[PDB]
Design an enzyme around this catalytic site. Structure first.
Site, PDB file in Angstrom:
ATOM      1  N   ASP A 153       0.507  -1.475  -0.027  1.00 22.70           N
ATOM      2  CA  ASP A 153      -0.221  -0.090  -0.130  1.00 22.70           C
ATOM      3  C   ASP A 153       1.307   1.235  -0.146  1.00 22.70           C
ATOM      4  O   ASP A 153       0.544   2.458   0.823  1.00 22.70           O
ATOM      5  CB  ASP A 153      -1.059  -0.112   0.763  1.00 22.70           C
ATOM      6  CG  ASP A 153      -1.947   0.874   0.561  1.00 22.70           C
ATOM      7  OD1 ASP A 153      -2.642   1.184  -0.315  1.00 22.70           O
ATOM      8  OD2 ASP A 153      -2.868   1.645   1.694  1.00 22.70           O
ATOM      9  N   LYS A 155       1.779   4.364  -1.021  1.00 23.43           N
ATOM     10  CA  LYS A 155       1.551   6.036  -1.843  1.00 23.43           C
ATOM     11  C   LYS A 155       1.464   7.167  -0.959  1.00 23.43           C
ATOM     12  O   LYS A 155       1.951   7.298   0.341  1.00 23.43           O
ATOM     13  CB  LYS A 155      -0.301   6.010  -2.114  1.00 23.43           C
ATOM     14  CG  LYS A 155      -0.735   5.206  -0.714  1.00 23.43           C
ATOM     15  CD  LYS A 155      -2.270   5.447  -1.134  1.00 23.43           C
ATOM     16  CE  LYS A 155      -3.896   5.122   0.072  1.00 23.43           C
ATOM     17  NZ  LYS A 155      -5.463   4.543  -0.144  1.00 23.43           N
ATOM     18  N   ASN A 158       0.120   7.367   2.495  1.00 26.90           N
ATOM     19  CA  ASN A 158       0.505   6.838   3.584  1.00 26.90           C
ATOM     20  C   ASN A 158       1.899   6.903   4.065  1.00 26.90           C
ATOM     21  O   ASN A 158       2.370   5.823   4.893  1.00 26.90           O
ATOM     22  CB  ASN A 158       0.856   4.995   3.257  1.00 26.90           C
ATOM     23  CG  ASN A 158      -0.922   4.204   2.958  1.00 26.90           C
ATOM     24  OD1 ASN A 158      -1.977   5.143   3.487  1.00 26.90           O
ATOM     25  ND2 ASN A 158      -1.624   3.404   2.712  1.00 26.90           N
ATOM     26  N   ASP A 171       0.106   2.151   7.758  1.00 27.11           N
ATOM     27  CA  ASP A 171      -1.044   1.801   7.294  1.00 27.11           C
ATOM     28  C   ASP A 171      -0.633   0.790   6.664  1.00 27.11           C
ATOM     29  O   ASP A 171      -0.044   0.424   5.875  1.00 27.11           O
ATOM     30  CB  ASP A 171      -1.495   2.453   5.978  1.00 27.11           C
ATOM     31  CG  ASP A 171      -2.761   1.625   5.224  1.00 27.11           C
ATOM     32  OD1 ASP A 171      -3.406   0.373   6.901  1.00 27.11           O
ATOM     33  OD2 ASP A 171      -3.229   2.559   4.889  1.00 27.11           O
ATOM     34  N   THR A 188      -3.919   0.392  -3.652  1.00 28.22           N
ATOM     35  CA  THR A 188      -4.572   1.802  -3.833  1.00 28.22           C
ATOM     36  C   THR A 188      -4.629   1.834  -5.918  1.00 28.22           C
ATOM     37  O   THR A 188      -3.906   1.838  -6.290  1.00 28.22           O
ATOM     38  CB  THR A 188      -3.909   2.833  -3.474  1.00 28.22           C
ATOM     39  OG1 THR A 188      -3.889   2.660  -2.206  1.00 28.22           O
ATOM     40  CG2 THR A 188      -4.996   4.472  -4.389  1.00 28.22           C
TER      41      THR A 188
END
Ligand code: ADP
Ligand code: NA
Ligand code: NA
Lengths: 337, 20
Positions: A153, A155, A158, A171, A188
């Site tokens: 995850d 991104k 995060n 996260d 995502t």
């Protein structure tokens, strides 16, 4: 010697993986101040710990929402892994606990805000600025991967900027300890590797793909593949055709072609030399990897910080009551939490 | 420009995770 460091790091992690921390605080030990951020089914609050006076970030999950979204295993993963890891660019889990209604993960408060908001506000980062962040992610992934962990995850939303201007990854919702291949369609959309989208099975190389997306987005100010709906995004990713901004260095473009590589046998991070193909790339030539690990490099940007529970680096969010039922919900489901 | 096209798009704010 990386070898020795990582070997001892695995020993430390495994001990905690095998016998996880549990029930290390309770709700009434904190005063809840305000929401810092949200995700698809979680809320994070700035809180003050009564007996210490310290501020923390409290991730609150409603057990019934976890269940309804079929995120039980992911959530157990999240806490099991987070409690076990230890690395300079990973956010610290300070406490965890549960009550009739909710699960709680209490982290160190990273007051500099999301990379996301700075990125969008500023527009884009210089290549040295982007490289500074990228290096941290490279090392973090080197660390995580060595423990058989896949992050899944990456991104800007995060990634938090700390008071020294260094990154803290948050996260771990999609983090998973897996040897070889896995199949869950999660992440995502802009950041998903083509192999995730195509239901093929996939491994840790998806993390390296995401690093590509991240670097592009940091450097460009926008992602390599965007559209108004996730399905349009997926088409673009799968084509893999990528265009670069005029201002991207040749070095940068070369690195990104090798990261945003649709062919696994070709993707940097996933070759015989592993992370070294990334670390030794001309784009990182100026990077002192040890200095970065040791947080000795001067950060390109240091967020303005005004006091202990200042939240000015974060957007405001609509608040809601934190309800606790008199009846235990999903007790069995979350036993190990 | 690509920037302009991005800025005018529906996904310039915080992006939520997907989990199917
Ligand atoms: N340790 C923390 N310090 C400060 N803010 C945080 C911290 N962790 C999370 N946040 C904020 O809360 C938001 C959601 O946290 P996250 O862990 O991504 O929950 P979710 O799984 O629902 O997306 C983050 O994007 C950030 O805005
Ligand atoms: Na998130
Ligand atoms: Na999440």
């Amino acid at each position: 010697s990386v070898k020795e460091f990582l070997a001892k790091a695995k020993e430390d992690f495994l001990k905690k993986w095998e016998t996880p921390s549990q029930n290390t605080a309770q709700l009434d030990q904190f005063d809840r101040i305000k929401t810092l951020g949200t995700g698809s089914f979680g809320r994070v609050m700035l809180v003050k710990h009564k007996e210490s006076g310290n501020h923390y970030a409290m991730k609150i999950l409603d057990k019934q929402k976890v269940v309804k979204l079929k995120q039980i295993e992911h959530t157990l993963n999240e806490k099991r892994i987070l409690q076990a890891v230890n690395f300079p660019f990973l956010v610290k889990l300070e406490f965890s606990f549960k009550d009739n209604s909710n699960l709680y993960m209490v982290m160190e408060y990273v007051a500099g805000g999301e990379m996301f908001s700075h990125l969008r506000r500023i527009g884009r980062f210089s290549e040295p600025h982007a490289r500074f962040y990228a290096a941290q992610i490279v090392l973090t992934f080197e660390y995580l991967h060595s423990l058989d962990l896949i992050y899944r995850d990456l991104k800007p939303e995060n990634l938090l900027i700390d008071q020294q201007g260094y990154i803290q990854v948050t996260d771990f919702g999609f983090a998973k300890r897996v040897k070889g291949r896995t199949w869950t369609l999660c992440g995502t959309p802009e950041y998903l590797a083509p192999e995730i989208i195509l239901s093929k099975g996939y491994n840790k190389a998806v993390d390296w793909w995401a690093l590509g997306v991240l670097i592009y987005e940091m450097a460009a100010g926008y992602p390599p593949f965007f559209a108004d709906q996730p399905i349009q995004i997926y088409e673009k990713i799968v084509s893999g055709k990528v265009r670069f901004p005029s201002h991207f260095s040749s070095d940068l473009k070369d690195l990104l072609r090798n990261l945003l590589q649709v062919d696994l046998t070709k993707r940097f991070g996933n070759l015989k030399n592993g992370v070294n193909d990334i670390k030794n790339h001309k784009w990182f030539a100026t990077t002192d990897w040890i200095a970065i690990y040791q947080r000795k490099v001067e950060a390109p940007f240091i967020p303005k910080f005004k006091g202990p529970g200042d939240t000015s680096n974060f957007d405001d969010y609509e608040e809601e009551e934190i309800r606790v039922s008199i009846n235990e919900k999903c007790g069995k489901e979350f036993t190990e939490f | 420009t690509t920037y302009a096209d991005f800025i005018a798009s529906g996904r310039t704010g915080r992006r939520a995770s997907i989990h199917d």
